[model samples]
Target: KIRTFAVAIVGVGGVGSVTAEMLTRCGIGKLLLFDYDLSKVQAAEHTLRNINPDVLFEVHNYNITTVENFQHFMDRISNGGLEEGKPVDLVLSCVDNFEARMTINTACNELGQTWMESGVSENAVSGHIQLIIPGESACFACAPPLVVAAVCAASLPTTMGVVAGILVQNVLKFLLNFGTVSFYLGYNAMQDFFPTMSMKPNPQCDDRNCRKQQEEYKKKVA
Candidate 1:
């Protein structure tokens, strides 16, 4: 049977927009996008359809910061016009702030869903991407960014392009069940440095749901 994939992209910013384009052109079964900005949502929908009109697409113009709203987001992913009987195959968090990232982390953990998180540094010259499986790896809350320095970050298309390309490549690898999926990867445009590492869940993670998922992961592996 040909497997169908449903994907969700939270925060259709620079990175999210490019990643969505990659997924749509690559032939994903369905896509659900969430963003507080209506302009970006509409712009993303337009760009995606132009890339591949046949792919199923939906966009929600709302924030994902509240518990109620997050639940609604989950419900839509679960019951949305995706391949029937399939939960979201993957979620991509490309939001600009930590609050939204944590909200997405908590929601995906609660749903037992796997997701990929991406972000550019405050300076925007560097960025990192991580593949997160609830209970299996350190989540955004487990080891959040050290400090979001209030510096004016210089975001360049070159930088976003590198990070977004790696993100989409990993997504393809994961969905096709091919290649080694990266747990964490970082890019530095200054010297063209790429760093890779892995993280274990912190037993003292602040998120209760993440800790619970940690226990579940251990039990399954044991």
Candidate 2:
């Protein structure tokens, strides 16, 4: 039933690897992987193929910050899909840095692409995932710009898998049109609570590209 969907997972670390494995075993039609690994995505690909040889995998190794690299990043997400000429069904941001998140944010905004953004807490106890709907909801840039946590946070395998599982569950729901997806979902291990909320796009968001999409969306709404 899920043999026709294509998904892009931008990080291949703890949460990302688990997410890919889940999607892999689920017999997802295709997976577009982007990672900062010279050697890691390649290694991950090996395990992924071993898990399910039938799942198509494309590993991209590039930093999106460069002027030249951003186009390739954009093209792959925009043109890569199971069916020709169509984009991946959805993009997942499991990246750790704000710079990385901002890049994904910019690409999705310009392409009007839908994506999920996930990050671990600075204290390493909680994690959160956000669904970004261009024009309809807040783009990552709509939030205050954040710096990469200067100090590394301790990561427990427990939190990693939990985030990945929840992220993948949301992806499956969206892919199958099965349930109402959370716009913003958060987990706090200290309090043992999962908080949820939604945020709107800032009309004066710093990203002009996001504003362009918002305007285009309004024209079609009326």
- Give the Cα lDDT of each candidate: 0.83, 0.86
TM-score of each: 0.91, 0.93
Q: Where does model 1 exceed 4 Å of error?
A: 1-3, 146-155
Prediction-by-prediction clash tally: 0, 0
> Roughly what TM-score does model 2 have, to 2 decimal places?
0.93
Q: Pick out the ten consecutive residues of candidate 2 with the lowest summed lDDT.
A: 145-154
> What lDDT tens digits, residue by residue, belong to model 2 across residues 1-222?
688989999989978888999999999999998887337888888899999998998888888777799999899888898886789999999888888889999999999999998877656788878899998898998986232221234356778878888998999899888988998888776676888878878999999889998998889999
User: Tell me, what's the RMSD of every candidate?
Assistant: 3.0, 3.1
lDDT of 1 by residue, 1-89 (tens): 11277888998888998889888888888889899943778888888888888788878987778777888888876766376656888
